[PDB]
mmCIF file of C-alpha atoms in Angstrom:
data_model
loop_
_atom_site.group_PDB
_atom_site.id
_atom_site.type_symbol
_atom_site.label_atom_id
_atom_site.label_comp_id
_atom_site.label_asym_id
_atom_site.label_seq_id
_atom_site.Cartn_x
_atom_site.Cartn_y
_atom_site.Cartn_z
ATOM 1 C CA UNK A 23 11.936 -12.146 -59.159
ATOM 2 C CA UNK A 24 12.320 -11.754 -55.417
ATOM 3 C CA UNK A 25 8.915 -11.875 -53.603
ATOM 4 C CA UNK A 26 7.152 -8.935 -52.113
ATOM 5 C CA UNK A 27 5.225 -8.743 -48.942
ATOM 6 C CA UNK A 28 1.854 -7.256 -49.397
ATOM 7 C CA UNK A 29 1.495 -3.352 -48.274
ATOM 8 C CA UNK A 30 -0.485 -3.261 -45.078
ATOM 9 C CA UNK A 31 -2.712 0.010 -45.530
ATOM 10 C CA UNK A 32 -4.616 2.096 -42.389
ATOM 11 C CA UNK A 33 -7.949 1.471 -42.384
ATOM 12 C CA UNK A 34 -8.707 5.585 -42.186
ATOM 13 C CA UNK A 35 -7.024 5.781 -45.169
ATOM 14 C CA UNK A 36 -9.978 3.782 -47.105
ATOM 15 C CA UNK A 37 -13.204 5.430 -47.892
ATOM 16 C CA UNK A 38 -16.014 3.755 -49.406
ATOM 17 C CA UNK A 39 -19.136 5.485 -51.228
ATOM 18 C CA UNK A 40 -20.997 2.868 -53.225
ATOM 19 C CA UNK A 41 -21.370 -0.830 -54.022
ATOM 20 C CA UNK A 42 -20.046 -1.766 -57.254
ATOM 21 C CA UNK A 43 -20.772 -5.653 -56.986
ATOM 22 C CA UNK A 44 -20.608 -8.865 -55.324
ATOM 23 C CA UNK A 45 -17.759 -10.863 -55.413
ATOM 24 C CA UNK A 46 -16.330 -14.344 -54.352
ATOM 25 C CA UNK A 47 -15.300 -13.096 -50.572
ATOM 26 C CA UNK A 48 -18.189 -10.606 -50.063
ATOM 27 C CA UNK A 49 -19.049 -7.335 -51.298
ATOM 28 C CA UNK A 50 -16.839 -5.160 -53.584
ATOM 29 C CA UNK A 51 -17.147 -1.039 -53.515
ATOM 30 C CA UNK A 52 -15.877 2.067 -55.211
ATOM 31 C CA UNK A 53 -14.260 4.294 -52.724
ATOM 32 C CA UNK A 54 -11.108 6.502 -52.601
ATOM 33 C CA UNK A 55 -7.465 5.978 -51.062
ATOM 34 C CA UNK A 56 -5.799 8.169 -48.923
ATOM 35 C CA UNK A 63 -6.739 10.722 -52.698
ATOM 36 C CA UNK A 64 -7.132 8.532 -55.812
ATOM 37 C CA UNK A 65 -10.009 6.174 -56.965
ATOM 38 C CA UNK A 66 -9.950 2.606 -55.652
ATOM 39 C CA UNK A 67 -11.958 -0.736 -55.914
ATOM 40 C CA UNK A 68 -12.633 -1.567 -52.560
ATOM 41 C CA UNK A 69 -13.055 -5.665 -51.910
ATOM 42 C CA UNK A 70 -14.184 -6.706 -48.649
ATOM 43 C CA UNK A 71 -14.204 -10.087 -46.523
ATOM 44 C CA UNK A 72 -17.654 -11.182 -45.434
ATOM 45 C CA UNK A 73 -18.953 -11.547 -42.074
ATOM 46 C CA UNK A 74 -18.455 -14.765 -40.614
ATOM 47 C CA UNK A 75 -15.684 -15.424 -42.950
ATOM 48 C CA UNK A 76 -14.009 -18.732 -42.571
ATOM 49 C CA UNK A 77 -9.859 -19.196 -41.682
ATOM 50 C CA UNK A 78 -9.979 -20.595 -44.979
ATOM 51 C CA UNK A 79 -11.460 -17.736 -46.641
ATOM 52 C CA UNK A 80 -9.599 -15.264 -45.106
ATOM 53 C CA UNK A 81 -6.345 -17.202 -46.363
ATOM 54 C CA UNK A 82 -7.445 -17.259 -50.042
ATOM 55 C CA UNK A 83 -8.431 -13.942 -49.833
ATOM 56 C CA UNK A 84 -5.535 -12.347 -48.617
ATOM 57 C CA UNK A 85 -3.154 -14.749 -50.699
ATOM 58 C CA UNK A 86 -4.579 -14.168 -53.688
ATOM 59 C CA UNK A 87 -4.258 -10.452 -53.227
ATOM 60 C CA UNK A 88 -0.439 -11.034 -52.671
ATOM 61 C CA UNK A 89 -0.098 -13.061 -55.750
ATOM 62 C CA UNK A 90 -1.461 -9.583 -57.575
ATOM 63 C CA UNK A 91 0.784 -7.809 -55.374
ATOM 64 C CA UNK A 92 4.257 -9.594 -57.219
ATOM 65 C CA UNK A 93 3.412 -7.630 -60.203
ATOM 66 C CA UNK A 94 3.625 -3.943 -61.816
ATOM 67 C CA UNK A 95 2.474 -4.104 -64.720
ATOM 68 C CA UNK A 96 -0.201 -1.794 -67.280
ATOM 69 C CA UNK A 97 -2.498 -4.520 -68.430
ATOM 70 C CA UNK A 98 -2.289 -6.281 -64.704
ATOM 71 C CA UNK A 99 -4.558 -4.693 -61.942
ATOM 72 C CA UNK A 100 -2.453 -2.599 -59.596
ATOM 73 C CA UNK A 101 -2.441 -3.953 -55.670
ATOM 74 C CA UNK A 102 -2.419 -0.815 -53.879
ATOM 75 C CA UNK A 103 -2.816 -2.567 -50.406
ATOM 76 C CA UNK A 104 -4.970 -4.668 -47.539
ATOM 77 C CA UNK A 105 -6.332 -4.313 -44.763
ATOM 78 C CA UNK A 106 -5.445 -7.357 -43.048
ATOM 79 C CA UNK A 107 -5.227 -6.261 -39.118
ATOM 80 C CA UNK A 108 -8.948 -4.609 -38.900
ATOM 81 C CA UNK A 109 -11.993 -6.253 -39.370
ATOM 82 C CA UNK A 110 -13.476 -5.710 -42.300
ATOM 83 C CA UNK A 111 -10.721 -6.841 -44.087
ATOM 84 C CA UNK A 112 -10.020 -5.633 -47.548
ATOM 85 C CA UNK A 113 -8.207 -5.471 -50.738
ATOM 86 C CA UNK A 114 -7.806 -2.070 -52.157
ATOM 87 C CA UNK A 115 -6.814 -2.157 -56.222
ATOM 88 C CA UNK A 116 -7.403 0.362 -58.779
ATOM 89 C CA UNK A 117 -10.951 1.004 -60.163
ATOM 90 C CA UNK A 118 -11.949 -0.608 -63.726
ATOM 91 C CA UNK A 119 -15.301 1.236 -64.408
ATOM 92 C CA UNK A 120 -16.269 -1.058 -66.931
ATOM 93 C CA UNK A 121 -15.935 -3.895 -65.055
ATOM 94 C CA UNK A 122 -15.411 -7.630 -66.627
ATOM 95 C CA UNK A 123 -14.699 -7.599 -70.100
ATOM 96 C CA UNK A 124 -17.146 -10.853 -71.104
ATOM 97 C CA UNK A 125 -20.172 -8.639 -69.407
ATOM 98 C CA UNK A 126 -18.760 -5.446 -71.228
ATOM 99 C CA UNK A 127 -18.564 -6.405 -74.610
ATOM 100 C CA UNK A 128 -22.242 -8.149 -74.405
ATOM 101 C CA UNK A 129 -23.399 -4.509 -73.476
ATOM 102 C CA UNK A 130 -21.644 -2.933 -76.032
ATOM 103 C CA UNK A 131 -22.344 -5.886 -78.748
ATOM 104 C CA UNK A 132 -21.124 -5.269 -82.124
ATOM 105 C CA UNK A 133 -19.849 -1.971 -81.364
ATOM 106 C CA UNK A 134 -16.637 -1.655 -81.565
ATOM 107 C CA UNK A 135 -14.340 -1.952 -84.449
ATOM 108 C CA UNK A 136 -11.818 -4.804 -85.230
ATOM 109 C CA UNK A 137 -9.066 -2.794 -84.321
ATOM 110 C CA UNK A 138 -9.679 -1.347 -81.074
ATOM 111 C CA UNK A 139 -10.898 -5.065 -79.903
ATOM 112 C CA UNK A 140 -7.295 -6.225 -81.528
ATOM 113 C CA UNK A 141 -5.852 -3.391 -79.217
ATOM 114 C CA UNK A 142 -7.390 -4.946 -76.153
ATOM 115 C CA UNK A 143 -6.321 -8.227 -76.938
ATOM 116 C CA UNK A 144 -2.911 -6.756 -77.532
ATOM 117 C CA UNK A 145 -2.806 -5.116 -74.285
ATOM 118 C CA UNK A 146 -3.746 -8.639 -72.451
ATOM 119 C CA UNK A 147 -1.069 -10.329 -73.720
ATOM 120 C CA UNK A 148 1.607 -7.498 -73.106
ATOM 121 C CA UNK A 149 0.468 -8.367 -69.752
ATOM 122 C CA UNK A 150 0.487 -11.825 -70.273
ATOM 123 C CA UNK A 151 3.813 -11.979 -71.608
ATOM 124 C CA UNK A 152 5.229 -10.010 -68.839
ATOM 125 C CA UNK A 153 3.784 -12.706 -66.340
ATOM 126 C CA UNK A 154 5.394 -15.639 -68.260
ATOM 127 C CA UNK A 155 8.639 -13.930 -67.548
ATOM 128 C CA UNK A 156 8.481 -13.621 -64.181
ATOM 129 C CA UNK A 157 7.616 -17.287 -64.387
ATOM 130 C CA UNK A 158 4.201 -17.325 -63.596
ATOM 131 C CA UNK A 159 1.012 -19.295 -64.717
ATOM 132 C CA UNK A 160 -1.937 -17.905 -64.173
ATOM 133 C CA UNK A 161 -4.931 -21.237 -64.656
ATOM 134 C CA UNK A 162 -7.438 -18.921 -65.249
ATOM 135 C CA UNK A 163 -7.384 -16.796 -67.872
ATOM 136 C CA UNK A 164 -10.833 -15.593 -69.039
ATOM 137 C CA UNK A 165 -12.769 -13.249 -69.811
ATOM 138 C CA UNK A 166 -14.532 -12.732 -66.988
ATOM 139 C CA UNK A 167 -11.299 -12.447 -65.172
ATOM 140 C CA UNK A 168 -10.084 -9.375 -66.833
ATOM 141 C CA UNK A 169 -11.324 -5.718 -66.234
ATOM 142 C CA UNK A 170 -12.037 -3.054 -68.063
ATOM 143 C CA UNK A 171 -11.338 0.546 -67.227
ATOM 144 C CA UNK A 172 -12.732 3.890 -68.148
ATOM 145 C CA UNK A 173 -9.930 4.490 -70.533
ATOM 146 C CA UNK A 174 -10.810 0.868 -72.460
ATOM 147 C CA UNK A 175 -7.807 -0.675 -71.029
ATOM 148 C CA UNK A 176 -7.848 -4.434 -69.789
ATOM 149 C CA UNK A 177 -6.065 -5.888 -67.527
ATOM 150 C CA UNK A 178 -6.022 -9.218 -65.809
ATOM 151 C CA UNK A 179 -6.991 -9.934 -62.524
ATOM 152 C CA UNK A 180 -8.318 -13.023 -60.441
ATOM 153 C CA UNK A 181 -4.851 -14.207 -59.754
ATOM 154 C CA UNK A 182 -5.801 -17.187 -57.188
ATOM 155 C CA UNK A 183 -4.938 -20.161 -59.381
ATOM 156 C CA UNK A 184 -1.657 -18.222 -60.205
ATOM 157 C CA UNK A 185 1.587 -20.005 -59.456
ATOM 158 C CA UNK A 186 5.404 -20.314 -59.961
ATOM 159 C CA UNK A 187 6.330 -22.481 -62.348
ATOM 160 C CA UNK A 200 -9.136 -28.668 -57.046
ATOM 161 C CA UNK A 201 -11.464 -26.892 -59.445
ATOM 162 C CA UNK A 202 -10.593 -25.796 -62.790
ATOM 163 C CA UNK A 203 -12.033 -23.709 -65.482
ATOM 164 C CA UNK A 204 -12.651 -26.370 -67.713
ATOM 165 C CA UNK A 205 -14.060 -24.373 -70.897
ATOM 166 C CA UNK A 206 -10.541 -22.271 -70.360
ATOM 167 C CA UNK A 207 -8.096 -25.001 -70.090
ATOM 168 C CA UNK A 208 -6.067 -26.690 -72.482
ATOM 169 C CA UNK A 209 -5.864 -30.264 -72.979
ATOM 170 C CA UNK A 210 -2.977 -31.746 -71.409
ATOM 171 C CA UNK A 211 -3.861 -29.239 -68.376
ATOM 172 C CA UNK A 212 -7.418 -31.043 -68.132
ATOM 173 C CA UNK A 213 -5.980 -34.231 -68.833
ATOM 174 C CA UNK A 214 -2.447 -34.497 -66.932
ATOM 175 C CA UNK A 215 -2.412 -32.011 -65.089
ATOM 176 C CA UNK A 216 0.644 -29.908 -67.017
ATOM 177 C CA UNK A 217 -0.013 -26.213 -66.468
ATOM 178 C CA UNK A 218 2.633 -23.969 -68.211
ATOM 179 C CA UNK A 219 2.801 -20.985 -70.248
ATOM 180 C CA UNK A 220 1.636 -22.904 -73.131
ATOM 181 C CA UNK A 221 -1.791 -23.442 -71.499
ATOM 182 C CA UNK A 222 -2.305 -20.106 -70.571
ATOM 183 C CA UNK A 223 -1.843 -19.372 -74.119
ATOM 184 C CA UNK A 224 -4.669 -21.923 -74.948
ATOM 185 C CA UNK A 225 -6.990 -19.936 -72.221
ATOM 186 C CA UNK A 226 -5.874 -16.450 -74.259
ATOM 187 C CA UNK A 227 -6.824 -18.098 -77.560
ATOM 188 C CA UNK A 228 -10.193 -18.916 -75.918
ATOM 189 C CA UNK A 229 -10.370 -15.295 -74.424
ATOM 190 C CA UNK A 230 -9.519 -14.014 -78.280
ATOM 191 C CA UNK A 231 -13.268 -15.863 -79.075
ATOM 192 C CA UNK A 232 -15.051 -14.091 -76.355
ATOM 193 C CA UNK A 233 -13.730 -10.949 -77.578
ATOM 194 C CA UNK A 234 -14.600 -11.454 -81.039
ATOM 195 C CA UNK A 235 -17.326 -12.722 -80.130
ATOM 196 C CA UNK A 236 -18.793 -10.115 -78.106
ATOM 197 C CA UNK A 237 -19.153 -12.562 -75.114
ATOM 198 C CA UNK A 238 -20.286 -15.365 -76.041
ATOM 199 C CA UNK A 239 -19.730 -18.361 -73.815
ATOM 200 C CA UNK A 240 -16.994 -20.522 -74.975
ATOM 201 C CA UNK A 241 -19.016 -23.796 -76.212
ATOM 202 C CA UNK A 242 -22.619 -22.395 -75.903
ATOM 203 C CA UNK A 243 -24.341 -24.543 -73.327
ATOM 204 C CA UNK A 244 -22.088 -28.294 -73.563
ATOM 205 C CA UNK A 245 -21.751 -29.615 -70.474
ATOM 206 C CA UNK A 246 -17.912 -29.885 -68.876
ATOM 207 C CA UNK A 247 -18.518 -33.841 -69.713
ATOM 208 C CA UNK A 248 -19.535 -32.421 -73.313
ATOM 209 C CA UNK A 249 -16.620 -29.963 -73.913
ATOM 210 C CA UNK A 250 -13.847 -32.440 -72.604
ATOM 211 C CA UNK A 251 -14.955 -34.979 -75.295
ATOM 212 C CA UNK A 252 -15.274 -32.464 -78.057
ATOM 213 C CA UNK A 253 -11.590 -31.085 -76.906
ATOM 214 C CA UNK A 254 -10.530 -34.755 -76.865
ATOM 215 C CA UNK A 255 -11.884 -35.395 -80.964
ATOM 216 C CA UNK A 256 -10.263 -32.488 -82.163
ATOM 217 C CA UNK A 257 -13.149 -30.048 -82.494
ATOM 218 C CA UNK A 258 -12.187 -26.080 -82.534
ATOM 219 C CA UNK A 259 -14.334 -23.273 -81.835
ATOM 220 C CA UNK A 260 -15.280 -21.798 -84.786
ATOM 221 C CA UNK A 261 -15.082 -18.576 -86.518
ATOM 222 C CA UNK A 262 -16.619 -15.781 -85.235
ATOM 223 C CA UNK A 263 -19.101 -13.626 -86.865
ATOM 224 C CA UNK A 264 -16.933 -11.186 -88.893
ATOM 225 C CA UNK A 265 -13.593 -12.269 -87.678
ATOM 226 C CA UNK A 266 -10.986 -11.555 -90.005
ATOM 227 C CA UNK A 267 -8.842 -14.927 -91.083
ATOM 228 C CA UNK A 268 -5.867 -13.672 -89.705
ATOM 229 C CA UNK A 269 -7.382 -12.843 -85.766
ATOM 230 C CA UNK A 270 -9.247 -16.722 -86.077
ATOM 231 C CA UNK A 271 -6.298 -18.726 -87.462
ATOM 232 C CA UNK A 272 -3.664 -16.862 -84.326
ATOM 233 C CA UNK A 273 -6.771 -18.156 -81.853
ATOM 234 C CA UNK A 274 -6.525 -21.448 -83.761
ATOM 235 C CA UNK A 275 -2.589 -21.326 -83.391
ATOM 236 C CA UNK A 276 -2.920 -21.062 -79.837
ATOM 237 C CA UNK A 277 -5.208 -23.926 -79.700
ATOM 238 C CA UNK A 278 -2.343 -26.231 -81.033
ATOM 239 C CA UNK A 279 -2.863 -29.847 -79.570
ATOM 240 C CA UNK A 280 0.818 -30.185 -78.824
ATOM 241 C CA UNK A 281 1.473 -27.194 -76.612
ATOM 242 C CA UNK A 282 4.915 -26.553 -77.749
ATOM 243 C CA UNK A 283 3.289 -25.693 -80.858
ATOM 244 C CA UNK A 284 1.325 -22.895 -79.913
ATOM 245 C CA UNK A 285 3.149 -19.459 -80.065
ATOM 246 C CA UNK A 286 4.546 -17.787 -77.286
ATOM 247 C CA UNK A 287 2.833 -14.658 -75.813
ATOM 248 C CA UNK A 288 6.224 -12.377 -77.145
ATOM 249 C CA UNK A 289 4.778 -14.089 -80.492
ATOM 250 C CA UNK A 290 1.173 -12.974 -79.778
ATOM 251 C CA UNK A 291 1.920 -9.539 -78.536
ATOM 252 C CA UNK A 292 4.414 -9.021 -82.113
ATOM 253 C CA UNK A 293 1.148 -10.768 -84.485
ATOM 254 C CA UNK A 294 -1.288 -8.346 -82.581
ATOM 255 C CA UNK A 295 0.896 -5.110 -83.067
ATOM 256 C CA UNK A 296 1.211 -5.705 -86.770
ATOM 257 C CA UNK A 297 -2.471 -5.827 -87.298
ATOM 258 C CA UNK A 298 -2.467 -2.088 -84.999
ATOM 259 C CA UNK A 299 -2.918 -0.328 -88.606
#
């Protein structure tokens, strides 16, 4: 894929009514574009050189990619103070804090619908040759219209701190980030879903979790999971990553339970 240059939008063009949270860089709003609904990110006063960097690159590593289940990157403001990143809105906001809200509701199949819809976006990512790192929950929103899509694309690369309780093995122990370990970190988001939110290995320390990945131990099955959703989150937890399916096999095994 040939890279893009991120879309430089007019600062009049950006209107923002209310505060919809707090994020890494500073404050995040709803607002309007233009005019269509937008999420509204903004750089905090006294932001660093550094900050500004990561802030604006990660918004361009969103910006390589047009796909349903990935946020859309409608623009920045990079030449005006405050600076911004304008994407669409997800009024449901992070997935992990949305199914703890709406615990137990929801039936196996549409939560096997989102899950499908992840890895369609997923497996588009892996073929434009990109690994994500950090592939969680958290890092995926939720929109009005139950629709997830991943976002937080900052660790994303072409093929420093990591999310340890995400990662797979050989990424936490030699540094070998591929597609296969984002499929690990989508088996572990499969458990959050299932599990309505849970955190991945309760309260275990990093310390705790690396030995437990190290002896072999698997979460295990949540509450009311049907065999065949637990064993495809224990098939992408394969020790030897080239044993783990592929996310064109994940997004096929999801569709056939769509029934």
């Amino acid at each position: 894929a040939v890279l893009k240059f991120t879309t430089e939008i007019h600062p009049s063009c950006v209107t923002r009514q209310k505060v919809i949270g707090a994020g890494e860089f500073g404050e995040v709003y709803k607002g309007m574009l233009k005019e269509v609904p937008v999420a509204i990110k903004t750089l905090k006063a006294g932001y660093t050189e550094k900050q500004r960097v990561d802030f604006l690159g990660e918004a361009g590593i969103m910006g390589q990619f047009s796909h349903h289940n990935i946020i859309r990157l409608e623009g920045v403001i990079s030449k005006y103070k405050p600076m911004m990143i304008i994407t669409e809105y997800m009024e449901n906001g992070a997935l992990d804090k949305f199914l703890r809200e709406k615990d137990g509701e929801f039936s196996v199949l549409q939560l096997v619908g989102m899950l499908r819809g992840i890895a369609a976006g997923m497996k588009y990512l892996a073929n434009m040759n990109y690994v994500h790192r950090d592939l969680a929950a958290r890092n995926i929103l939720v929109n009005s219209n139950l629709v997830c899509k991943v976002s937080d694309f900052g660790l994303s690369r072409v093929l420093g701190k990591i999310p340890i309780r995400w990662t797979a093995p050989e990424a936490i122990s030699y540094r070998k980030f591929t597609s296969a370990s984002d499929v690990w970190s989508f088996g572990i988001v499969m458990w959050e879903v299932m599990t309505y939110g849970e955190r991945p290995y309760w309260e275990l320390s990093n310390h705790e979790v690396m030995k437990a990945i190290n002896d072999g131990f698997r979460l295990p099955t949540p509450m009311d999971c049907p065999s065949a959703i637990y064993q495809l989150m224990m098939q992408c937890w394969q020790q030897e990553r080239a044993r783990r399916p592929k996310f064109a096999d994940i997004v096929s095994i999801l569709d056939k339970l769509i029934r």
